[PDB]
Amino acid sequence: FSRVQIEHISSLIKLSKADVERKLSQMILDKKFHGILDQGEGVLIIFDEPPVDKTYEAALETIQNMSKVVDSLYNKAKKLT
Amino acid sequence: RPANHRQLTFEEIAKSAKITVNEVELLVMKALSVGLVKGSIDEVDKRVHMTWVQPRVLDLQQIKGMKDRLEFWCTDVKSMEMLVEHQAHDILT
């Protein structure tokens, strides 16, 4: 269950809320646990939007395509001088 | 209703069927077992979300409005599609 209260999820894990909030947030620090907690109302919500794949393809192309035009700087600026 | 706008509320069913709010569950879900609707019930606001429908009868002056809903689809596709290939008719040859 994504959205859950912190006190009764600490009742399922049988632990105090202080080190439940800090360990769960430590799991968010590890990125293995997708989600975040809420201290104000004592809520914990899980949400994810995994795929970056298209940005990886884009960046891989264009970032190297910089050096591509740098490689064309050699030939096309050689005919000038 | 023209709808959909297929999401209803508990006040609509409970007022029409004049039955208690606890029995509207059995009410709408039995209709799900009958097969006339596949919809789902949102029980937070106690809303009822219908899906599809069971066709039963209909009526006169409905074949006319049916031609209106059709001919509108006719001039829609005709116009837009004749605009599509109006652009690319040149380059084809």
């Binding site: - | 066709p55 074949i63 059709l70 689809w73 290939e85």
Partner: protein, 286 residues
Amino acid sequence: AVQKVVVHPLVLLSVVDHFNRIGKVGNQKRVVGVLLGSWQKKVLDVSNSFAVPFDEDDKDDSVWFLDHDYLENMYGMFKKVNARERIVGWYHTGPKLHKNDIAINELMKRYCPNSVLVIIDVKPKDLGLPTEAYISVEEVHDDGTPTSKTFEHVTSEIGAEEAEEVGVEHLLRDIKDTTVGTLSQRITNQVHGLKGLNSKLLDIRSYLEKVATGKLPINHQIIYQLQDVFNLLPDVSLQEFVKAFYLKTNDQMVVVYLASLIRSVVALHNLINNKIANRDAEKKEG
């Protein structure tokens, strides 16, 4: 029973060339012959056929006869040369079947357990894939009338195997092939769209005309339920259909993003390499 049939161009031409046979002598009525089918599975396939001389009086519009000796020994001829071929039914050129066509199938039900009759069209006009397919079945009725036979429509598709592909694929010599991706899909957007407009138009014209003239009745064995199926989905927003909108917008994101990526790659390679070989050929020769 029979779901769909595969009509090769060979059987269609085998009816149409016989429409030249009796068409040069004329006059009225239609070209009727015996259909040779091939049943490998629930999907039906057609390979060869043969046509028999047929005449039908109008007097007496219900009178029809065929030559059984022609059906017998020629089936003995075609089964001999090809053991895979057998008669699955008969066919006629229509264009619209008169009520007498039922008893023809009822006579040849002794030859085949289920005889599917194929209406065909010798002159292509409208609206689409030619011919037609009707299977012989007893549906009775929801009104509990004494059992009568109204032939159910079988969807017909055109196909081939190997040599029947060789002949026609060389015989086209007409339009570009395909071409894939540019003209193909958009011309299909014209044909399937516009022929879908005039289809339901003329079909809804028959919906109102049959109510205006021709009653009884036709309203409503299926009129009330079929028309309500038209009223099943109007179908507009609010609400979730608004979510599908910008979600579809989020769907076109990726593809058009990739489009700009191919633009950068195609422009990079082609422009750089062409200008290289261009400036080099000019400075070396000049």
